[PDB]
Amino acid sequence: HMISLIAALAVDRVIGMENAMPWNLPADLAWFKRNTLNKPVIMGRHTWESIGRPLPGRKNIILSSQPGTDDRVTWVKSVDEAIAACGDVPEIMVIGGGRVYEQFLPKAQKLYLTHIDAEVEGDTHFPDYEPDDWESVFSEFHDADAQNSHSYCFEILERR
Numbered sequence: 001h002m003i004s005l006i007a008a009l010a011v012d013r014v015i016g017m018e019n020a021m022p023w024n025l026p027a028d029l030a031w032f033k034r035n036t037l038n039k040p041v042i043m044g045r046h047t048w049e050s051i052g053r054p055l056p057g058r059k060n061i062i063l064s065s066q067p068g069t070d071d072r073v074t075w076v077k078s079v080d081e082a083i084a085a086c087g088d089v090p091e092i093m094v095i096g097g098g099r100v101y102e103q104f105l106p107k108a109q110k111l112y113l114t115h116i117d118a119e120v121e122g123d124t125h126f127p128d129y130e131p132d133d134w135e136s137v138f139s140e141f142h143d144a145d146a147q148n149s150h151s152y153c154f155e156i157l158e159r160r
């Protein structure tokens with residue numbers, strides 16, 4: 001049907017550090033929940049470990065080459081099996097991390113991207129996507145506030 005990627009990117013497309021999120025942005029985690037609730041979410045094993053528990057109200061599908069270690073989620077061994085395990089849904093949400101985003105970007109018709117105005121040390125990056133292939137269909141900028149220590153911009157891109 002449709003595969004979408006959702007991610008939050010700091011400067012230089014940094015998305016992770018030492019298997020952790022290198023910022024605290026509750027408005028963006030709220031945006032993540034709004035856009036993934038009641039959809040299947042595909043993630044790599046490292047990201048499963050960084051989240052630390054099943055995302056409620058979502059079918060959690062974990063890519064790993066090795067046997068599953070938690071029966072509260074669905075474990076799959078390949079990209080194609082991950083997609084199949086989602087069932088017939090209107091939209092599959094791929095939620096990272098870097099290695100999984102790389103594999104699903106060529107398959108994706110939509111990107112939900114938060115651009116965070118934060119300079120951050122990172123060992124993991126969102127894939128380097130060709131801008132000519134993508135049209136911005138939504139953009140919403142927000143200044144920092146008492147709850148969110150960085151300004152940030154919500155964007156949705158659709159593949160041209």
Ligand SMILES: NC(=O)c1ccc[n+]([C@@H]2O[C@H](COP(=O)([O-])OP(=O)(O)OC[C@H]3O[C@@H](n4cnc5c(N)ncnc54)[C@H](OP(=O)(O)O)[C@@H]3O)[C@@H](O)[C@H]2O)c1
Nearest residue numbers: 007008016019020044045046047064065096097098099100
């Ligand atoms: N800010 C964001 O938007 C965002 C989103 C997600 C994660 N992150 C950050 O990203 C970092 C983790 O990303 P990552 O790139 O290190 O790891 P990852 O992509 O989350 O997971 C990588 C692992 O998933 C499994 N995997 C991936 N593709 C597979 C395939 N085709 N077949 C079988 N197994 C497959 C392997 O597990 P085995 O080694 O078990 O085979 C691989 O080691 C963390 O720092 C996390 O905080 C940030």
Ligand SMILES: Nc1nc(=O)c2nc(CNc3ccc(C(=O)N[C@@H](CCC(=O)O)C(=O)O)cc3)cnc2[nH]1
Nearest residue numbers: 006007008028029030032033051055056095096114
């Ligand atoms: N836009 C975006 N921001 C992120 O922080 C993000 N993070 C991941 C991977 N990491 C995480 C880490 C924590 C939670 C999490 O705890 N979310 C809960 C709480 C929502 C909230 O705090 O508002 C959830 O129910 O979704 C989700 C993904 C994947 N895509 C993303 N996409």
